[PDB]
Amino acid sequence: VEYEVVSKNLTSKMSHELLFSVKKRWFVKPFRHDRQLGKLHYKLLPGNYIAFGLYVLKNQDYARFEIAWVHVDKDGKIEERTVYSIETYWHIFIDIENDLNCPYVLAKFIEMRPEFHKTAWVEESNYSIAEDDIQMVESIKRYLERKI
Ligand SMILES: [Mg+2]
């Protein structure tokens, strides 16, 4: 199964979506990264993945952050759900990058946001976090709650 997520930076707004490998425990290698529509493409062994989404209306100093759970079965059948959604000031997410005491995956995801008018690029990372998906997703929430 190849699944589609949006990844675009426009003068008005950005929308930064990234899948995550519960299995490899670090972001998923996209084969194609379309700059022509604002899209990423994915090759993924059927199983469990976390969609990290970041939407930002800059003229509103606005940013909505969401974590969804992507469950796709051995028949290729997709089903999603959001597990988490926070809304907040965009300027706050920027500072979270520099925040040292801030969940690495979160603090790195913010870092992978797309260059102006282009598509965020997932890198070959052979580093793996300590926590399993649940512990992680939690501390990513534990933090944001406090950081707002
Ligand atoms: Mg299942």
From Swiss-Prot:
Pfam families: DUF3258. It comes from the Viruses. InterPro entries: DUF3258. Gene3D superfamilies: 2.60.40.2930. This is Uncharacterized protein ORF157. It comes from Acidianus filamentous virus 1 (isolate United States/Yellowstone). The lineage of its organism: Viruses, Adnaviria, Zilligvirae, Taleaviricota, Tokiviricetes.
